[PDB]
Design a protein around this ligand. Structure first.
Ligand SMILES: [Mn+2]
Length: 603
């Protein structure tokens, strides 16, 4: 029966639970074949070649083993509207807002979900192969890591998973008869194709739905092939589901990069930072610092799982195995370590391709040689005069973390790394100083809770988690607050930064990139215990910030704090938190709102 559709590996080789899971969805999705992924280079080579044949991937000959996927323009990014969490009670997923609709997540009834499921998955994989992906989120074999099993009908998803996680036979070895997260994905285009196929990229935008069923330890994704919607260990699992798990077990799951910074005296600290959309998450994570004698090393650029250790140190681990980085804006100047990481074994999605088989995108800042032309991401010849970018703004590179030249020696340490500083941020063209320090852990929690960022629209993005909350944000805030009561906790110092303050002409006041190291320097020394008090927190006092080697900086305007602006700021924050979190807003947050309001009143 089933055994006969297996084209790689052995049913009997799977632990019973894994097998039962496979049997159930195979019988449900009706795939022509079953491929049990082993994660070997050989298998990867096979899948890539096939992908080349079917025209799903193109080979980029300028580089060593680099590929390019072009998608249907209708499937290029996460769709928040189509992203849901399924629980018995709405309250458990999102707070009931005072007005309008929740901006803190999208909830769906068990009932509505069954209907939506039944309308999508039966026979969804016919004419296609169902791949079985065993994967570990976090270092392989660590008892603190979580294992998942993802069923997919997309070889692109497979090849990407091989990079973004530990994947294959060794993962199954470690799982044994242990529990796992059930992950079901399907591009939603059974053969024969009922609709036209674009760029050989199967997707079903109409019926696109990314679901999470925490009580069942299940993730169910339909209709999109885009990474955030299909790499189930990443957002769906390592952020959403995990934040819920963690909330139940004392730890934390955050949208945070993790970096290790060393001063000229050899002292080293690890910092974590939560930044929204652009904001240069990856640029900070693998920054080449401008300050002589300093050293920045990368642990992770997207996700952090943190748990207090026996001495009360917040330990962070990167459960990812690679970087799913935004490509436009990436250059030698802005992120030299990133350029180097991707010279090899990397999958690019939706970038442009030079005629010598290289890659290209806005802000690559790499002049073309005589006679090199550009094929844009829509497979058309391209010039600067066409009025559309050569690469999609959300285009991606998918690269092994082990290739980053400054990958931290402890990025896979099962013990994790001790966080001494948490950094919040956003793109605020006006009003918010370059860097400020929270006055207390409670105030710091409020700072993260107050996060806003210019997507020309400025939106709220609490802890940079707006699209990723796995449960009630009100409760998420309480959990964070409770940390100040954990026995002998060594709470990280909390800062808020802004690299995007503009002058009236809209020109940046701060150069950024390598120079942010200067800000990092200030944070580092503060952790070691100086400040100028302001209503919003501590800023660097005069001449404390290291400006040696910089052109001129308008420090006066960069750190300017206006009552007019901050009046409207706390006003907007209060309204947002009270309306959106409503009955679930922790009173400690209420106190910080009022306290900030008070402090602003005496200026
Ligand atoms: Mn992210």
């Amino acid at each position: 029966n089933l055994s006969a559709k297996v084209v790689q590996g052995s049913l009997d080789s799977l632990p019973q639970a894994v097998r039962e899971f496979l049997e159930n969805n195979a019988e449900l999705c009706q795939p022509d074949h079953i491929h049990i992924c082993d994660g070997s280079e050989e298998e990867n080579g096979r899948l890539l070649g096939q992908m080349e044949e079917e025209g799903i991937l193109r080979r980029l000959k300028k580089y060593d083993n680099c590929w390019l996927a072009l998608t249907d323009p209708r499937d290029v990014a996460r769709i928040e509207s189509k992203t849901v969490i399924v629980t018995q009670e709405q309250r458990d997923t999102v707070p009931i807002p005072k007005t309008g609709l929740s901006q803190l997540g999208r909830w769906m009834s068990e009932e509505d979900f069954e209907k939506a499921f039944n309308a999508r998955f039966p026979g969804c994989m016919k004419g296609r192969t169902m791949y079985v992906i065993p994967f570990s989120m976090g270092p392989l074999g660590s008892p603190l890591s979580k294992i998942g099993i993802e069923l997919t009908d997309s070889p692109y998803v497979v090849a990407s998973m091989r990079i973004m996680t530990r994947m294959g036979t060794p993962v199954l070895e470690a799982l044994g008869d242990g529990e796992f997260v059930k992950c079901l994905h399907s591009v939603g285009c059974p053969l024969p194709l009922q609709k036209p196929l674009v760029n050989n990229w199967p997707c079903n935008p109409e019926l696109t739905l990314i679901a999470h069923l925490p009580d069942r330890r299940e993730i169910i994704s339909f209709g999109s092939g885009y990474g955030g919607n299909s790499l189930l260990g990443k957002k769906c699992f390592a952020l959403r589901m995990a934040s819920r798990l963690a909330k139940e077990e004392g730890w934390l799951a955050e949208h945070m990069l993790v970096l290790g910074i060393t001063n000229p005296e050899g002292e080293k600290k690890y910092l974590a930072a939560a930044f929204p959309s652009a904001c240069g998450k990856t640029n900070l994570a693998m920054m080449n610092p401008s300050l002589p004698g300093w050293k920045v090393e990368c642990v992770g650029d997207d996700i952090a799982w943190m748990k207090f250790d026996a001495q009360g140190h917040l330990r962070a681990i990167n459960p990812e195995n690679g970087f799913f980085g935004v490509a436009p804006g990436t250059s030698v100047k802005t992120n030299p370590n990133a350029i180097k990481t991707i010279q090899k074994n990397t999958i690019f999605t939706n970038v442009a391709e030079t005629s010598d088989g290289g890659v290209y995108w806005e802000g690559i800042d790499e002049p073309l040689a005589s006679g090199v032309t550009i094929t844009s991401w829509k497979n058309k010849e391209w010039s600067s005069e066409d009025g559309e970018p050569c690469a999609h703004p959300n285009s991606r590179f998918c690269t092994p973390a082990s290739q980053c030249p400054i990958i931290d020696a402890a990025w896979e340490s099962p013990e994790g790394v001790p966080i001494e500083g948490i950094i919040f941020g956003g793109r605020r063209p006006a009003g918010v100083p370059l860097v400020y320090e929270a006055l207390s852990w409670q105030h710091g929690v409020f700072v993260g809770a107050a996060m806003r960022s210019e997507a020309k629209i400025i939106m709220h993005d609490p802890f940079a988690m707006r699209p990723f909350f796995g449960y009630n944000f009100g409760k998420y805030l309480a959990h964070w607050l409770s940390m100040a009561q954990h026995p002998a906790a060594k709470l990280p110092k909390i800062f808020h930064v802004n690299w995007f303050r503009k002058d009236k002409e809209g020109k940046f006041l701060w150069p950024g990139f390598g120079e942010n190291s200067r800000v990092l320097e200030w944070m580092f020394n503060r952790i070691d215990g100086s400040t100028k008090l302001t209503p919003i927190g501590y800023i660097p006092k005069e001449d404390a910030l290291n400006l040696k080697g910089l052109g001129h900086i308008n420090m006066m305007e960069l750190f300017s704090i206006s009552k007019e602006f901050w009046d409207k700021e706390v006003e907007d924050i209060e309204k947002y938190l009270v309306d959106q979190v409503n009955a679930d807003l922790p009173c400690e947050i209420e106190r910080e709102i009022l306290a900030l309001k008070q402090r602003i009143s005496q200026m």
